[PDB]
Design a protein around this ligand. Structure first.
Ligand SMILES: *[C@@H]1O[C@H](CO)[C@@H](O)[C@H](O)[C@H]1NC(C)=O
Ligand SMILES: *[C@H]1O[C@H](CO)[C@@H](O)[C@H](O)[C@H]1NC(C)=O
Length: 274
């Protein structure tokens, strides 16, 4: 049976008023910060990073500062938008190259590095949109092969942030089928009828965790106390946390997002139940 792990992953980059990345890591509330989102990519070779107006000039320094404090920083690709797809093996490999040379251990004269010499700690796949033609499995495998634990490089935490419902959309299922994802953040705060904190998340949680034994599962909760899917701390303590932790592959809690958490201080208590 699983149990508390003390792990709390939070999303950052959705609202410039949420403070700098450095501030997030300095709060001592998170064990991982995931920036969002690289929202444009595909078979045409055009890539875009959208951090909602945040000052990009200081992100590199903040990333390194976070890492020095033991807080890894990841980059989520995708999002709720419609500007991305990965319809071929070639497009998947080109995206890997772009990520590698722009944010990780790669270096190419023609490719600028948004955060300078900072080297990110992971990649999260937030694939709201996709088709059976997408090849996220090819991208995932390449990223997994660069998760080095005993050689020239550093660990790369490969994750996916998915909808509550099981089974997942085909393109997500194809990627997860590789079996090499380290963590999956199951969003239980979407309005999805039959599958959210109000009703059905537990059943889906059972299916998700059982289907991917090698992957650690995080319960995704919203820090927006105005949401109909918000879970009061006392209900996380006596309900959500205990139930989620019954599974052997429970990994922790994911929070959406830094902005909301900053306004409600949700993690102040939640980090103790994770
Ligand atoms: C694309 O990659 C997948 C997985 O490696 C492979 O099964 C498929 O044959 C590839 N498509 C081709 C033939 O380029
Ligand atoms: C949570 O703590 C912060 C500390 O700065 C405080 O500003 C905030 O008002 C608190 N949350 C509430 C009750 O709004």
């Amino acid at each position: 049976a699983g149990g508390k792990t003390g792990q709390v992953t939070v999303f950052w980059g959705r609202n410039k008023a949420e403070g700098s990345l450095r501030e997030a890591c300095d709060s001592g509330m998170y064990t991982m910060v995931t920036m969002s989102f690289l929202d444009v990519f595909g078979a045409n070779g055009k890539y875009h990073l959208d951090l909602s107006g945040h000052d990009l000039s200081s992100v590199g320094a903040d990333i390194k500062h976070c890492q020095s404090k033991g807080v890894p920083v990841s980059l989520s690709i995708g999002g709720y938008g419609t500007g991305y797809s990965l319809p071929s093996n070639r497009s998947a490999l080109d995206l890997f190259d772009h990520l590698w040379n722009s944010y990780f251990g790669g270096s190419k004269p023609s490719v600028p590095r948004p955060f300078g010499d900072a080297w990110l700690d992971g990649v999260d796949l937030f694939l709201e949109h996709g088709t059976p033609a997408d090849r996220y499995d090819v991208l995932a495998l390449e990223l997994a092969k660069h998760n080095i634990r005993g050689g020239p490089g550093k660990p790369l935490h490969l994750t996916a942030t998915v909808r509550c419902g099981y089974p997942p959309a085909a393109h997500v299922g194809r990627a997860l089928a590789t079996g090499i994802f380290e963590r999956v953040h199951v969003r239980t705060y979407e309005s999805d009828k039959w599958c959210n904190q109000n009703l059905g998340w537990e059943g889906s949680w059972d299916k998700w965790t059982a289907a991917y034994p090698a992957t650690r599962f995080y319960v995704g909760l919203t820090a927006d106390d105005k949401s109909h899917q918000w879970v009061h701390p006392k209900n996380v303590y006596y309900g959500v946390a205990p139930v989620a932790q019954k599974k052997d592959n429970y990994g922790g809690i994911m929070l959406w997002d830094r902005y909301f958490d900053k306004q409600t201080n949700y993690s102040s208590l939640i980090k103790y139940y994770a």
